[PDB]
Amino acid sequence: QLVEYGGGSVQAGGYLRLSCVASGSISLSSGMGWYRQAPGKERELVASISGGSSTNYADSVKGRFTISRDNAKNTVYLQMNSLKPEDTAVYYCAAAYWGQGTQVTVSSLEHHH
Amino acid sequence: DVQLVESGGGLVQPGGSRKLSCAASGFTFSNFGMHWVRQAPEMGLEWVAYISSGSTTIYYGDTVKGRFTISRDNPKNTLFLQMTSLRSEDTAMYYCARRPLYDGDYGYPMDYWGQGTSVTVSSASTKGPSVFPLAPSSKSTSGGTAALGCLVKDYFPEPVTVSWNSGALTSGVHTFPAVLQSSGLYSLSSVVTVPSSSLGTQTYICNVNHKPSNTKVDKKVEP
Amino acid sequence: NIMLTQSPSSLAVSAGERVTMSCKSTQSILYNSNQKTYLAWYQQKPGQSPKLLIYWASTRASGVPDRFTGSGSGTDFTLTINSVQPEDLAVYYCHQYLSAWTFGGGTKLEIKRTVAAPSVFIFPPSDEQLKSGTASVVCLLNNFYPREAKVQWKVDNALQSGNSQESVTEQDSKDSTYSLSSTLTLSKADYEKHKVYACEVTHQGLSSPVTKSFNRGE
Numbered sequence: 001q002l003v004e005y006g007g008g009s010v011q012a013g014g015y016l017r018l019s020c021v022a023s024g025s026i027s028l029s030s031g032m033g034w035y036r037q038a039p040g041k042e043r044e045l046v047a048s049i050s051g052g053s054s055t056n057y058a059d060s061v062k063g064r065f066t067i068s069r070d071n072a073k074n075t076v077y078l079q080m081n082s083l084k085p086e087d088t089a090v091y092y093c094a095a096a097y098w099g100q101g102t103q104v105t106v107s108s109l110e111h112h113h
Numbered sequence: 114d115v116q117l118v119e120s121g122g123g124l125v126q127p128g129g130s131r132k133l134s135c136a137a138s139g140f141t142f143s144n145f146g147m148h149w150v151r152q153a154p155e156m157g158l159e160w161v162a163y164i165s166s167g168s169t170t171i172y173y174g175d176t177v178k179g180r181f182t183i184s185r186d187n188p189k190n191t192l193f194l195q196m197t198s199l200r201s202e203d204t205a206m207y208y209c210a211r212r213p214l215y216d217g218d219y220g221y222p223m224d225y226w227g228q229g230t231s232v233t234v235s236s237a238s239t240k241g242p243s244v245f246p247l248a249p250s251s252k253s254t255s256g257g258t259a260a261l262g263c264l265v266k267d268y269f270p271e272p273v274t275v276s277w278n279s280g281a282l283t284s285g286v287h288t289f290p291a292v293l294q295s296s297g298l299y300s301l302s303s304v305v306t307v308p309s310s311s312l313g314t315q316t317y318i319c320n321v322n323h324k325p326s327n328t329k330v331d332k333k334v335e336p
Numbered sequence: 337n338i339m340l341t342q343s344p345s346s347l348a349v350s351a352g353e354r355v356t357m358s359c360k361s362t363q364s365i366l367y368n369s370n371q372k373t374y375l376a377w378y379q380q381k382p383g384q385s386p387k388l389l390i391y392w393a394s395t396r397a398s399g400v401p402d403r404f405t406g407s408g409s410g411t412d413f414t415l416t417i418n419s420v421q422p423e424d425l426a427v428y429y430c431h432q433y434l435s436a437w438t439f440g441g442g443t444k445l446e447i448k449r450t451v452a453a454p455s456v457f458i459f460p461p462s463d464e465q466l467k468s469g470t471a472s473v474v475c476l477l478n479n480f481y482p483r484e485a486k487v488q489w490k491v492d493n494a495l496q497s498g499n500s501q502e503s504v505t506e507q508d509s510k511d512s513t514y515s516l517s518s519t520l521t522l523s524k525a526d527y528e529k530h531k532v533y534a535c536e537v538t539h540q541g542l543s544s545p546v547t548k549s550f551n552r553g554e
Contacts, residue, residue, distance in 0.1 A: 009368055011217075012170075039339045039362040085172065085436045088337065107367065107435050108172065109217030109374075110146065110165075148437065158378075158386065158429055160437035172436060175337070208385060217369065220392040222376040222433045226385035245465040247474055252550045253457035260457040260476055264465070264519075287478070287515040289503040301503070302517050304476055306455075 002026065002093045006078075007102030011109065014083045018102060020093030022074040027051075030095050032076040034067060037101075038089040046091070047078060060086075080104075115139040115225045117209050122230035124239050124270050124325045125199050133230055135192040135209030143187040146170075146212035148223050149194045153205040162194065163212070176202075199234045206231050233270035233325075240298060241326030242268035244319065246334040247304065254309050261334045262304030263319035267296070268326070275303040276320045312336045338362055338432050340440035348446040349420050351512075357443040359413040359430035366409075367434060374434035377406055377415045380442075381426045382506040389428075390415065422447050422512045447512040453541030454480035454516070458534075458548040461527065471527035475535030475548065477516040479508070486538040487518040490549075492530045496520065527552065 006018040020032065029051040036046045047067035048056045055067055064082045069075065076093065083106045090101040121133040135147070149161040162183040163172040171183055182195040192209050206229040213221035247253075247262035254260075265273055275288045288303040303319060313336075321330045339362045349355045365374045373393040378386035388397045390406040393413060403418040417424055425447050430440040454477035461471035477485055483504060489496035500520045507514060518535065534549035 038337060086175075086337075088435050103363065105363065105435055107217075109367065109434070110212075110215055111217040112215040150437075157441045158431075158439040160439070163437070174436075216374075216433065217367070220370075220372055220374065220395070222374075222388065222391050222431060223437070224388050224397075226387075228385060243465075243468070245462045245472075247459040248462065250459075250550075252548060253459055253476070255455050255457070258455065260455075260478065262459070262474075262476075264462075264472060264474065266465075266472065287505050289505060289515075289517050292501045292503050292519070294501070300501075300519070302474060302519070304457075304478075304515075304517070306478060 002095065002097060002099040004091060004093050004099050004102040007091060007104050009105040009107060010083055011107050012084055014106070016080045016083060016104060018078040018080070018091055018104075020076045020078075020099065022076075022095070026074060026095055026097060028069075028071060028074050032069070033094045034076070034078045035092045035094055036087075036089040036104075037092065043092075049076060115211065117211065117225055117227035119207060119209055119227045119230035122207065122232045122324070124233050124235070125196075126236050127200060127234055129199050129234075130195070130197045131199065131232065133194040133196070133207055133232075135194075135227060137190045137192065137209075137211075140211070142185075142190045143167075145214065147185065147192045148210045148212060149183060149192075150208045150210055150223070150226075151203075151205040152208065152229070156205060159205075161207070164192070196232070199232075201234050204232060204234050231272055235270065237269055237297065239325040240267065240269045241323050241328030242266060242273055242300075242321060242330070244321050244330045244332045246332055247302065248334060249307075249309070249312055249336050257309050258306050259309040259312055260304055260306050261317055262302055263321065263332055263334060264300070264302050265321055266300040267294070267298045268300070268323055268328075269298050270325060271299055273299075273301065274322045274324075275301075277303070277305060278316070278318055279320055282317070337438055338365060338435050340430050340432060340438055342428075342430060342440035342443050344443060345441070346444035346446060348448050350448045351420055351422055353420055354416065354418055355420055355445065356414050356416045357428060357445075359408070359415070359440050361411045361413070361432060364410055365432045365434040373409065373413075374432060375406075375408065375413050376431040376433060377404075378429045378431060379424075379426045380429065381423075381509065386429060417445075420445070420447070422449075423509050425507050425509055425512070447507055449481050449512040451541045452479065452481040452513055454478055454485065454537060454539055454546075456535065456537050456546050456548045458550060460533070460550055460552070466524055466527075469524045471522045471524055473520040473522075473527075473533050475518040475520075475537075477518075477537055477539070479511065479513040479515060480539060480541060481513050482540065483514050484540070485516060487516070488536045488538075489518070489520050490532075490534040490536060490547075492532050493534075 210223035377390040459474040
């Protein structure tokens with residue numbers, strides 16, 4: 001199965017880096033996808049990396065999120081720049097094989113600094 | 114003190130557009146972020162849009178993104194909501210509300226709300242009410258108490274506002290929720306109880322305002 | 337988004353009792369920076385705008401009576417009113433303002449009180465309305481409790497059906513009572529076909545039904 005790390009809570013504009021570690025029967029050739037689920041909304045593909053390392057991104061994250069892989073560890077990474085409140089959700093790794101997910105929260109508070 | 118006043122509501126056909134305004138006074142407008150929030154009986158309270166003090170940060174609710182545009186004119190102390198491609202589901206009371214400063218530091222949420230401006234989306238045509246007296250009489254008296262009122266019939270859309278004596282009379286007033294007539298037009302009554310001994314010397318006038326039809330009517334209710 | 341669910345949808349208590357309502361979120365609304373919980377409670381009285389009661393889950397806004405308290409953590413929050421007063425009649429909304437802005441669906445607090453019989457009044461159609469060819473006859477039941485009341489129209493002693501519409505007010509914020517109108521609507525021609533127009537009211541506060549009536553043209 002798969003294990004997601006790296007979730008957390010950041011103020012809008014912030015950065016997070018998720019990782020998804022594969023174990024056992026998972027083949028790199030099958031590729032990997034990062035999905036996102038918000039309450040009462042349908043699961044949405046966020047980013048995908050094929051066995052041949054071709055990348056694809058949902059239009060809602062194009063230009064902000066990138067996906068990559070460490071082939072030898074079979075670990076897939078989601079770099080999330082310029083986070084927005086709408087990016088708040090549980091993020092799942094998929095190959096199908098699903099994971100427990102990791103929570104991402106993007107706050108939108110104002111400070112006097 | 115702080116004062117927010119929304120305007121610009123009315124009746125809009127589906128697919129149409131409308132611009133709402135929110136006039137702010139009693140504080141330094143240009144220092145505060147502002148919100149539009151809307152309310153419909155089936156909708157509860159629903160946040161619509163946010164604009165920061167300098168308009169650098171703007172957020173929208175999911176179901177209005179792409180159709181609604183929030184803006185502000187700081188010199189003229191005004192907030193705006195441009196609505197496009199209006200749908201039946203956009204029918205609601207629209208409120209503007211102030212975002213206190215630095216909620217990440219002090220935690221104050223949106224705190225001053227206006228009275229709201231009403232928007233109805235439908236293809237039916239507006240129609241202003243007829244206003245009729247409900248005169249006090251021996252059949253509307255009980256133990257020194259007299260009841261009187263105004264019948265406000267055959268209007269579209271909601272709402273109608275009813276006051277008495279230009280707002281100076283409020284005690285004992287009951288302005289009923291409107292009923293929907295089989296015609297598709299609304300009707301309501303506003304009543305009040307007063308001393309029967311007052312009927313010869315006091316003056317009781319109902320003021321009816323229906324903004325969508327630009328109807329303003331004052332009806333003196335005589336014994 | 338961070339969603340909020342409120343329970344119960346409504347409830348009723350008497351003056352002086354203690355009441356608690358609940359708000360559940362789909363995730364924590366704790367801000368890591370200051371360990372504060374970004375949940376607020378608003379009160380919306382009939383015909384008014386929402387007014388802030390509580391922020392940071394448990395801090396009273398300036399001027400709010402001591403009897404309002406807030407509590408919670410994780411995903412569970414509550415609002416408690418210690419000694420309910422008739423003026424607390426309202427819908428209560430919870431609100432999260434950590435990530436964007438969302439609201440619960442509201443809990444409506446109704447007030448229980450002692451039985452109060454209605455005062456009954458009847459209004460013939462106005463001459464101004466009769467000019468338009470329609471006659472509305474209005475029966476008014478004023479300041480009663482409970483809400484249940486049976487209002488029957490009788491025209492020349494014949495029970496009417498199918499020509500009347502009722503409307504009831506919200507509870508009164510000071511005395512917790514209701515008022516109710518029943519409006520009988522007829523063509524002018526039909527109105528002129530009869531003499532006695534009567535409204536018969538049955539209510540728990542009346543020992544026997546009360547009738548108010550008039551004779552067309554007096």
